[model samples]
Target: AVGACVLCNSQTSLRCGACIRRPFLCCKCCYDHVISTSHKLVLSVNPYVCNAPGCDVTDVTQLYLGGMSYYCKSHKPPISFPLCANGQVFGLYKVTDFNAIATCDWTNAGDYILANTCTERLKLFAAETLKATEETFKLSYGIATVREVLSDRELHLSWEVGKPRPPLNRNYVFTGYQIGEYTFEKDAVVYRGTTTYKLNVGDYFVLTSHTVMPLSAPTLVPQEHYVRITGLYPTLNISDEFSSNVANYQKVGMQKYSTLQGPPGTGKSHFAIGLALYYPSARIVYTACSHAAVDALCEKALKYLPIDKCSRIIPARARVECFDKFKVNSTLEQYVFCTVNALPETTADIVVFDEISMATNYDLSVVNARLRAKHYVYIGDPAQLPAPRTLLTKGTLEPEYFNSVCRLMKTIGPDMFLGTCRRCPAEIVDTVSALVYDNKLKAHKDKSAQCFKMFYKGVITHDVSSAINRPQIGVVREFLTRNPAWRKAVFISPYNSQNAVASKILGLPTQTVDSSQGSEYDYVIFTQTTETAHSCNVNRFNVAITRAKVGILCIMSDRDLYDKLQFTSLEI
Candidate 1:
């Protein structure tokens, strides 16, 4: 049904209001009527004064249109506005103060950690242009604020705020801008809110601007060890048993970042746990790429230490949602295990990053933004599997600091080199060493792993590439048909198409190589899906075969792929 006029009973051209769903029909007078937050009706602009209250700057350069008002370049655009700084005017939502931190570049704002204001949640719907597109993006729902200054490294911080770590349900996309039925023809970044491409699992909340941050920027006191290691120090402290590696160990930990490289089964966790055991009161913060990885290491550690001493700290979201599995709260636990999403809320004496290769620079910054440990420990096998996630904002990180702590540690160098393969057979170890680690890895004797000997020269090939992969199917089917007892096996492939075909025919559920990390089976059959390796990086191949501890069955196109990875001896 046709609606009446918005201001009066005059039925005229209808335009969608900013906050409302439908457009408003108004007369020529109302069309040019200067609107406010209450009158957020879409209408032609009668440009004269920049509508940022108290400012009279204006021009006819086709200025910005706020929800209910219009603004000039100096006050409207929050991102690139030249004159306004230190919490100035916003086109969409008129907040008392929206704190600006160091040089704003929303793309790399990471956590909006610098935003320490209690600016109430006002729907600041803004876009360079709002277009009636099929996709409608929900803009900033809320901003993160710190209720109190709390504490941080060598810095004083106090914010008249709302609450710390407020749901970071905000983000900005610099590529383009969109508003209520508005369209843009040039590059744009929305202020009230814009686009969000994932940086990590769920790190879309972002706020940015090019405003130069003040010297008195906000910081908490968690920076004790954080500052020292960056350029400060770490005194000698450890138990006598590890005294052999203690001095050199603390020496490594004193650097900006210290890495302990270990090949698969090398006990990256074992050594790091030993380090934790040495300094039981160090208050370490343990984390890994995936929850599965965290759970694996946590379980392994559980075998040695009790939960009271080592606990898994749930993130605020999980805790708020009442994740029963996690009884430990961030602030309550001295030593804890947490996901990157649930960074520690308490002080961290040392932060143990396992599977460091999978962590991105942006992910690290977000954790650091919340809390930084005095001493940082990096434990990973750069050869295992690097992170699949990408941060489009920061682009490709440096060769050494390539978002992965593993990559950065390779540059910073390692204090310990763990090459012993405690998880695989010697045959598997040699293949993995040759293929990925350049003969740097070695096998450790495990008296209990007598069954692991079946993996000698563990290469099962189809000889020639086939259309049906009948030989490959026959291998799996025959193996299972005869050795039904060894059902502790998983069917995995590099490509899903291969798994879909095999799963249907074999009646076995399958997983991709990406899903197999931090997990192991007694036996593993990895189907190489394609005729060629697809130049699949060494990391990908290594993870595929290493999923097995006792044995591996590889059904690939040819023996050449195996030939390329083989090395009979540790060298000659």
Candidate 2:
């Protein structure tokens, strides 16, 4: 008697009479729209920008079935992002909004014959596409272009022309795709997606199930959102750029193939989490060089993911933040799952790497695998430092930076990248950028505005009592207790203090930011500013600096490194 139909947008289907208790809107229009849109088939193109894995292709024109997912036949072809316009090479990937039937997983009971046919046909189509791409072009860019000739048969591929006349130069590159074990499975006609490769289906029903169900899984919920950028204080340089970047990210869904670099507290992870929240249909995978970072993101996800969503999913040992708000239906320790393999084997719509600078070649390869998703976000601070490895050693900076940049240039092609640094006060942002990047772009610095600029004294040893007993700790604690609500704060150090400071003042082990992931604090006191300046341990301390949000307070015994004039010139 009250609500209108949610389906066909009509009054007859409203809860006008007996339907009130049914939990549905109306019967006529609502049912009609559902029936109309249900079991539908749609063909779309996804234009992508390939920036990773050193792709030379200009564009990645992707084909999606009703916005549910990207389609690659059994014999997957190298597909990047952003469709090329007028034959110009733009290193990108693009998939148009193409909808198809949401085929039930192979074991979903009915339609075994149809599912089997679909599976086999998809395989054939993939093979055909790959075959066409490969056979058509023998140069380096294997499957440069894939044009769809058929939907159900999975027939499609217009390969890009491989390498140019110059032996060393590569103008166009073949698109790349992932091949998994699911493709060879006997019963995967439906469950085989994301695993199937080089298969073809000439014609199959694009039922409503194919188009809506998968995309409608509600992978994203409010409160958990993220933003991503390559550099720093974008807000100061370009007004609303931070918000704009978030908007663009939301529109584009999650970027499955992009990396963000920034010093910690510069806010890479925050922006990523924001994106996750903005796109509920996204699956997120978070990784880190250390288990600590992984645990941190997962822990925060617990609090950030909408409460409603957590409740629907069955609780398990790993599920910590369980609730049922925002339509979330999975058990998220922090609304995220951790995987060593670093690819999608679960329901996550997005995958994130926290402090991604710690990633190894192995992790980078893993990123190449799952990058087919609607979005991918990576946050790190290359300037802050990198993982403790040869590639990251200060001595190797020249070659390492060169190789990494060259590799990225290979993937993204020649496109002016988006650069914004909105994490620090504009003054620090500018200084860090200038010192690190030589001021190619003006780093914004705000001298007038004020946020708490806290202070700390580095610990000579890992011990907390002696570390805190020092007069500096008293001042920081006073800053907290005097505030009264006894608001929670964070203390970061290179050495594990157990629950020393947290237990003493913050009141419990649970309050310790370092205890695990997903923990946030009003203020963070970094115990070792000295560590950040250490050539030997600078990388580890970089992790500590990036952890804070509102402000960072570092105590340092190494005044030469922590309190010197050179600091005045370096950008944050």
Candidate 3:
């Protein structure tokens, strides 16, 4: 400022009212000059200007995204709301008219930013012409680093997060990080899509640094026999009506690659049990990704089949979460249970994978190579949450996010959608069926098929004590006490912080929606905050929604998003 301060005459940026003359003062000056309030503010301390290109600004002091850029009043985002734009390297991820949020896990940069305390580090990501209609806000504790800026919209990003999901080989190819190099994430997020490898169709590799690899061939390498023996098989039989329909079972057995895509309560367990017995003479090696799934399958199998015929293979670590009654040691007699991580080699008649939707192609291929069988039966619902996968590049819905079984079914077959919701109440079947499986699934005539939802207008975050013990917990406390004939009920909180607080207040094991997979309850009360409600990696609600066959209870903190987000869950 060339002029001096009028009030103190110290350093006035104030100019004269007349031509290069009057430096009017305050109230005394106001009365003297008659015009003081309208005096132009010409100077200030900490002078800063807008960073926007070709802009005219001087010390008005306006701030913008990241506070890294300073835009004056003249420069505003192209949209009404603050959205990721062309030059914004880091900013809030915004979208129009959708009640959802996107995010990334943490990285070192995120750690640095959060130490001083800020919101989730949702760095500027793809500015796509094609935005997800569901959720538009990105609320990650992530970082910003340039990868491939594809055009002006979508960009190929790489987030070195802490908990990256490994890749899945879908249709002979798996997509992951940085081509053939060790993943930069070594932990979080998916990498580049590379399939030009020298591995056999069935060969598999144990991920180093938790890496996932795949091959390029699509036609499949020289890829069953069903009927020649029906005539002779009718001889010495278990039942008179059985071999009569032996043709039905054997023809299916003949498919070198037999797959049964079943929905919940569609009698997959019963079908699995029948497979174990239908070809009573054939050796069957059954496997699943989840221990609980294997446990449940065996639970049903033990009912109809001979006990000695089945066995549960424990992991090398020997840490198994199983019902106390389940046997870890048994004769491989004819059928055996093994997890995908520890798929043992035992060439047999039929090799089937239950919960196949939760298995990556890498696991499936390795198992396929080792247990080369006469026929392979892949049985699981593709609609259910896929096996855990690497984080998507832009929080996108990609093939890598889903189990390879989806690819297999897509290329090979949907084969069948067993539509009856046998185990679930008519209510659950209707919800899950309509939302994910389409109305293709019909509830069994007899069905506790109940679903209830409520959102909070009051503050529903945090906990302290009786003085202010989060009203959210009280809401559940009230519902838990007012039992709706619930034999067994459970709570699912996505936030581990809430899990601890809520679990303590409720006196139960409160779990995460992610952890609730492969588990079920008579009644499930799932909880989530406003922002988390927008993040659905595995149709987060479906994981919560389907866990209860008796009914699904959802509690959200935001009433504004309740109907929108719940409808986002299912038509419910």
List the candidate 1 regions with Cα displacement exceeding 4 Å: 1-249, 252-256, 316-326, 390-401, 445-471, 482-486, 507-509, 531-535, 558-560, 565-572
Estimate the lDDT of model 2: 0.35
Worst 10 residues of 2 by lDDT: 206-215
Estimate the overall C-alpha local distance difference test score of candidate 1.
Answer: 0.48
Q: Provide the lDDT at 304 for model 2.
A: 60
Select the stronger candidate by lDDT from 1 and 3.
3
TM-score to true structure, per model: 0.53, 0.38, 0.55
lDDT of 3 by residue, 415-440 (tens): 54566766666655665665566568
Q: What ranking emerges by TM-score with the best candidate at the front? A: 3, 1, 2
Residue 15, model 1: lDDT of: 38
Model 2: per-residue Cα lDDT over 1-572, one tens digit each: 33332332333312211111122233332222223333211111322223234543321233212232233222133552322223322211210000011222222212222211232222222222222332333333322233443333234433334443211101111122432222100001111223334543332211011111001111111122336532111222322424545544543342334555544344455566555565544445565545446545544555566543332322232212322232333444334444333234443455565565444333444444443333445555444444332112132332133223223433443112234544444444443445443453233334313223333443443342223323445555565665443254466544333234434554522222223223344445654423332322443433343343344454444544354211222111
Write candidate 1's Cα lDDT for 181-221 as tens digits.
11111012112212222112212232222221111111111
- Report model 3's TM-score to 2 decimal places: 0.55
lDDT of each: 0.48, 0.35, 0.49
lDDT of 2 at 425: 47
